[PDB]
Enzyme design. Sequence first.
Site: not given
Ligand SMILES: [Zn+2]
Lengths: 595, 193
Positions: A357, A487
Amino acid sequence: STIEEQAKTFLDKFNHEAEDLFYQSSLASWNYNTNITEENVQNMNNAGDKWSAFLKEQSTLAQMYPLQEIQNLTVKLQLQALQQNGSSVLSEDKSKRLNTILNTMSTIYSTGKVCNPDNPQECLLLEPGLNEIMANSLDYNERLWAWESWRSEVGKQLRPLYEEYVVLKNEMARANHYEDYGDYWRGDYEVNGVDGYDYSRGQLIEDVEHTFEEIKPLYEHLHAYVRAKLMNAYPSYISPIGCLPAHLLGDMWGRFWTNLYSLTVPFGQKPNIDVTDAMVDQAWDAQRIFKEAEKFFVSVGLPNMTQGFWENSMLTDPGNVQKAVCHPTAWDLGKGDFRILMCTKVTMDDFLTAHHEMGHIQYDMAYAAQPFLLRNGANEGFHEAVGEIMSLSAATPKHLKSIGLLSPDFQEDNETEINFLLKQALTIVGTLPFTYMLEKWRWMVFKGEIPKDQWMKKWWEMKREIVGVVEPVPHDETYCDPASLFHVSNDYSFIRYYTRTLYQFQFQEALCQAAKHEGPLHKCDISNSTEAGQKLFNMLRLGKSEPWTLALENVVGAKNMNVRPLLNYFEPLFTWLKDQNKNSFVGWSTDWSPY
Amino acid sequence: TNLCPFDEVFNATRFASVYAWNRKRISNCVADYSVLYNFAPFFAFKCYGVSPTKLNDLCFTNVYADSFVIRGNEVSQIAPGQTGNIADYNYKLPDDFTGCVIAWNSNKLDSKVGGNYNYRYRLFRKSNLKPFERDISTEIYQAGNKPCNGVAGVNCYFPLQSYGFRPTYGVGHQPYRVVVLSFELLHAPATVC
Ligand SMILES: [Zn+2]
Ligand SMILES: *[C@@H]1O[C@H](CO)[C@@H](O)[C@H](O)[C@H]1NC(C)=O
Ligand SMILES: *[C@@H]1O[C@H](CO)[C@@H](O)[C@H](O)[C@H]1NC(C)=O
Ligand SMILES: *[C@@H]1O[C@H](CO)[C@@H](O)[C@H](O)[C@H]1NC(C)=O
Ligand SMILES: *[C@@H]1O[C@H](CO)[C@@H](O)[C@H](O)[C@H]1NC(C)=O
Ligand SMILES: *[C@@H]1O[C@H](CO)[C@@H](O)[C@H](O)[C@H]1NC(C)=O
Ligand SMILES: *[C@@H]1O[C@H](CO)[C@@H](O)[C@H](O)[C@H]1NC(C)=O
């Protein structure tokens, strides 16, 4: 006043207005995700509606410029981004039909409750139970039942919806000056107008097939090893010359083989390097985890987190007093506001997640000076590539020893590197054929090479030909097997996971060569190196203002995808697998069936 | 002793916008420049034509004080020979400036939760300003070959834009109070010492 000057003035006004308006929507979304209430939902909806209306009204004025009389690349790119009509060229009733179809497919997948014949009121839904009954289970009949039941229940309800979805999206793409909706998806990797860096929408397929041709042998060897071990696991069920049944791969769809590590481990006596006990013994917390990752980026030569990042971010679970989403996320609210939403525990996985992150955050901070529409990655597969290369160097034993989490009285063994490489390959190299085959199938369906009376048959023969997976029992043409995936039923592209995987190892090898590494590639560490950081920043600062081929040449030195670094990374495991596969058959026969 | 009123331009409840900047003349008093250090943390204390120490042993005919509020990104544009959106359409300094530019962060006073749209700046002025020019005119800017009839639309824009300061932006987009002092020593007896 030439039309280009009018375009520049319009772009200036649009930039100021959009930067003012987007921040409110981002802040409302952050408030809702951090603090779930009823007023926050209304505020978020109102902000989103205002932003969408503003974007529509600005695009409508944007089509006023011909775009054929612009000699500046930046203005041309911004106007091209602004002028796209999207799903509005078609009629209104057709738009309502498309939205209704999307919503009903999404809600059918979301609810998807499945009962059991044992008891009328013992139904198991998807996210709880069914994932457990397909991942950690060992019984053949139970997982066979789950695999058949879920897919039969879901896929025999979406086929008429999916056909109308396909035809409506093809019509929209044709109305948007595209051959088909697959070409609309492929248009993200298209670079034109710059000499020496010209890329065509049709070159992506050829390049992907060229890479997969070189990938195939390692996948064949790993598949043979897994087949032998799983045949040892399941007696009188797997033919040594056949294909692996679908329901024995540890997942509902077989996307990842990471849950097969328990059955397939080279040296089970030796355990992997776990650090959680060392972290707890030293009384670590969420603050210490996010302070030891900032030092990693500082030692490389990149800027450290701003002063408001610590004040505004949520790095701990708020508890039961208020409800928040626990999915880690890096938030770029704009106007210099960067935050991270995460519920950090004292575990080893949260270390790597924090590194990932913060890599995302640093990438976002790199191009904060670019125009509003050019503040993104060069294509869809550079954020994740940067995050994974950041999280890859922080898991090596050398880095753990340096920060003291590993005792100095520790030496690596040849029986541990192979085990770690196999564990990582069960996740990385075991998913490429699945993604490739799924995207190829959807491209063929959209183009029309597959008639509607050949969907399931073509799907399940491509599965045997490319992936080497055979269906448990035959499925009639009333089934929609691909729609079971998240998806597929929610209109998401599924090719970024291949290009991103290649870019990961390309970037890692480039940074390894820049840092003067001496040993194998799987022990490299970019810490304490400033030239590698400068070379990476040279590309991170560009954003989306230059072709991705130029950025790739800036980092690596090539203008196209290359799979050689991945093979260099996995070479020791490949040699060991070849050594252990002396008395087995490599390959599979599609004619064999388990029914 | 009669001290100059530096407590009225430096410590005021509200400043003025960039396009309409406030100018004040100071004469016939005794200037105590060390009082300017009463605040202490200054984001910028540049001085051109005079020593970094203020040299309280100088006498000038009069002093001019200009006050406004800008971003933190645009502070570097308040300098001789600078180009940009503030130095070309809002406030320009001559190439032979002799004075001091002081700038400090005022995020706790000029920023509000939800936005502070009381601070505006000029865009699309159609021409660069000469040094020390105000141009507080508000007329529709025409970028095109079709004249605007006094109303906005298509290629007709309102020249003034808002800042919308909020807490939790970051030092780049946070309010900054700027005071520029200029010393005009041109003939006549010296009355400021
Ligand atoms: Zn990521
Ligand atoms: C969350 O929202 C509720 C609803 O108004 C509010 O009372 C509470 O103070 C909020 N919590 C935080 C931490 O902002
Ligand atoms: C395009 O315009 C930008 C400013 O909008 C300018 O900086 C750039 O130099 C222009 N491109 C070329 C090739 O001159
Ligand atoms: C978008 O739709 C409008 C409406 O007719 C049309 O004039 C324009 O050419 C379209 N632009 C693109 C890029 O398709
Ligand atoms: C974080 O950045 C600041 C800003 O320049 C600088 O002092 C240094 O790189 C870092 N500070 C600390 C205390 O690590
Ligand atoms: C990096 O540099 C730091 C400080 O100079 C040092 O403590 C550390 O051992 C070096 N190596 C690694 C892998 O962190
Ligand atoms: C407030 O006014 C006093 C004089 O009364 C002055 O000393 C101080 O510097 C002012 N504060 C500012 C300018 O921030």
